[PDB]
Amino acid sequence: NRGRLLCMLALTFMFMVLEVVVSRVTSSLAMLSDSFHMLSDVLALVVALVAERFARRTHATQKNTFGWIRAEVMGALVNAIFLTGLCFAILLEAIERFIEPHEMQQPLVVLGVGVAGLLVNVLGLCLFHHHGQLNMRGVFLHVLGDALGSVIVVVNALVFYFSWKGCSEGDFCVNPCFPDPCKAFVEIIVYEAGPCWVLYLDPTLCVVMVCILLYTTYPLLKESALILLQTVPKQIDIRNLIKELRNVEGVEEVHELHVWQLAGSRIIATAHIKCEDPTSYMEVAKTIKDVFHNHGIHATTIQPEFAVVPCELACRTQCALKQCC
Amino acid sequence: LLCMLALTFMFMVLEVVVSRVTSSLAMLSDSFHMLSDVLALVVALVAERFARRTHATQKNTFGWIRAEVMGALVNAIFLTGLCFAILLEAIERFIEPHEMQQPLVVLGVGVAGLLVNVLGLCLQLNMRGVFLHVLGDALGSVIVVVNALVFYFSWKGCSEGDFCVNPCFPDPCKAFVEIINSTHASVYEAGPCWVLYLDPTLCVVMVCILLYTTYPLLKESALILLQTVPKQIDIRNLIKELRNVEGVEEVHELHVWQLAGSRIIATAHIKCEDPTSYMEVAKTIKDVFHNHGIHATTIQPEFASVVPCELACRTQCALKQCC
Ligand SMILES: CC(C)CCC[C@@H](C)[C@H]1CC[C@H]2[C@@H]3CC=C4C[C@@H](OC(=O)CCC(=O)O)CC[C@]4(C)[C@H]3CC[C@]12C
Ligand SMILES: [Zn+2]
Ligand SMILES: [Zn+2]
Ligand SMILES: [Zn+2]
Ligand SMILES: [Zn+2]
Ligand SMILES: [Zn+2]
Ligand SMILES: [Zn+2]
Ligand SMILES: [Zn+2]
Ligand SMILES: [Zn+2]
């Protein structure tokens, strides 16, 4: 399953190579800036790949009792947070550009690199649209946002090429809205085409792309936080399980019951319940195990308790604030 | 603290606005650090509010006590992302250098940042806890201050018609296509390489120091959050001590993880010998855990084969049941 990540990384490196070649042949720092921008996506792909590689190992090592299966969701959360930070930086840059306008040069090469990146991201997203792994969904969202930004840049460059006249101080081109550098040397001791309508196009496109990306990734962040913060997921309700356990004649009371998911469908519940007599403890244990298996529970550690007090067992002395919840 | 948090947030907003209006990479890094700090304060306040009346809500039986460490990790990751963005900006500045407008405004902003950083940890547990943070913030502000001072002290700019503009430095239409077309005033740039390189090198050093400082916190948060044994407990020694107990003969499904802080969770699965008694051994194993860092014990005993655990269900356990 790592082949998709590997080929995505290879495509990113190929894009880096073509972008740096274009920068060298055209002597434009904008291509280098674009390569640095795509380095964030390359890093996200590397994070996804290493997360998958560590998820491939579930041998219950010395330090990790459960195993590094949680690394998948943790890396998904890290990638989502990195995408959010990149969006915040992009929003700051967009605000600065709206305050301080800045055009672009060599629209042909810009369009070529933009459409190349758009094709790369489309190929990546089509392969990633096979959809269960939350990290895969996060990387898919990230790639979709990238693609949206790339196509927005392509459209902005194309519409800029359609109507805009460059100048070499021979003819007055920049509109009065755009501040000339040092008043063009006091006007050296046509007014172009599309003075300011095209100027607002790129900020609007990038901010709407950022908003769409944030709205699409917010459910991913919510799911990652809910699963990671040890909260009961859907299809499992504490009230229904408590009712289905209490009415069982084997148990007498239920207390200290904790339910947290491990990864995806892997969920573990711990119950500390009290029983009447040791006789037929398997009959009670088998019954409650079957009831839990009826719900989403498959693995659990249910502690029988034998005889007012909240729990027969407790921490040494009256020390508190160390017991769970 | 809340008023201090609001004041720091306002100062960070003004610093970000000033950096945007002046393209100051060092000021941008200082504002990023201030933003990270204010979000850390917001996360701490949210955690305190949540834990003020934390209970076993239907959403989480285990409680929301992990929110503090989770928010700390989110703040750390956000700071790392902003730092990588700043590093990319510094690389771009290496490719495309820029010259700042008003060094005096930058110097004033840096002085104000130093003052607010000093005032931060002055208000106790806070002083001892954040002395290192105050020192680091002071160093970061001082870096920006000295960079701005060096820029203002020696740089000579071609505000009017003069030849001091560096041809290697980008120029408007190549000095407006050599607008003067003659010998201009060779006021010189006063070592532009010595000058223009100061800000990017300074911000690179600052972000390197920031990552060096925040990295151990990131590893601590990652270890605490993802299910890992605490540094104060040895798994092999603990299980060897547990197996010494007469009641238990073998163990399976042994899991240890910690909620947050000093909270410890331990799960056991004991085959036992005589399930009828269950006395003088449950207390024994409870004491066995408690003499170690465990305080919350969930040691469920199995009652008696070839199968590791008799209680068990479908094969889905392979993909559902914990190892
Ligand atoms: C090029 C950019 C992206 C990063 C430039 C800085 C890194 C090369 C430095 C900054 C902090 C360094 C880390 C700081 C501390 C440690 C711990 C140390 O390794 C251990 O885990 C030993 C025990 C310990 O000291 O915690 C040495 C490697 C490492 C990860 C360092 C690896 C190199 C890092 C990431
Ligand atoms: Zn991306
Ligand atoms: Zn099952
Ligand atoms: Zn009890
Ligand atoms: Zn509890
Ligand atoms: Zn600070
Ligand atoms: Zn204890
Ligand atoms: Zn068993
Ligand atoms: Zn297990």
Swiss-Prot record, chain A:
GO biological process, one term: defense response to bacterium
Keywords: Antiport, Cell membrane, Cytoplasm, Cytoplasmic vesicle, Endoplasmic reticulum, Glycoprotein, Golgi apparatus, Ion transport, Membrane, Metal-binding, Nucleus, Phosphoprotein, Repeat, Transmembrane, Transmembrane helix, Transport, Zinc, Zinc transport
Extracellular side: 26-29, 94-107, 161-193
Catalytic activity field: Zn(2+)(in) + 2 H(+)(out) = Zn(2+)(out) + 2 H(+)(in)
One GO cellular component term noted in the UniProt record for this chain: postsynaptic density, intracellular component
The keyword Lipid biosynthesis appears for this protein: no
Cytoplasmic side: 51-72, 215-325
Membrane topology: Multi-pass membrane protein
Post-translational modifications: N-glycosylation promotes endocytosis and degradation through the proteasomal or lysosomal pathways.
UniProt induction comment: Up-regulated by zinc (at protein level). Up-regulated in macrophages by LPS (at protein level).
Transmembrane segments: 5-25, 30-50, 73-93, 108-128, 140-160, 194-214
Pfam families reported in the protein's UniProt record: Cation_efflux
Subunit structure: Homodimer. Interacts with TMEM163. Interacts and forms a complex with TMC6 and TMC8; the interaction regulates zinc transport into the ER. (Microbial infection) Interacts with human papillomavirus 16/HPV16 protein E5; the interaction alleviates SLC30A1-mediated transcription factors inhibition.
Function of the molecule: Zinc ion:proton antiporter that could function at the plasma membrane mediating zinc efflux from cells against its electrochemical gradient protecting them from intracellular zinc accumulation and toxicity. Alternatively, could prevent the transport to the plasma membrane of CACNB2, the L-type calcium channels regulatory subunit, through a yet to be defined mechanism. By modulating the expression of these channels at the plasma membrane, could prevent calcium and zinc influx into cells. By the same mechanism, could also prevent L-type calcium channels-mediated heavy metal influx into cells.
Family listed: Belongs to the cation diffusion facilitator (CDF) transporter (TC 2.A.4) family. SLC30A subfamily.
Stored NCBIfam families: CDF (TIGR01297)
Name of the protein in its database record: Proton-coupled zinc antiporter SLC30A1
Species whose genome carries this gene: Homo sapiens (Human)
Gene expressing this chain: SLC30A1
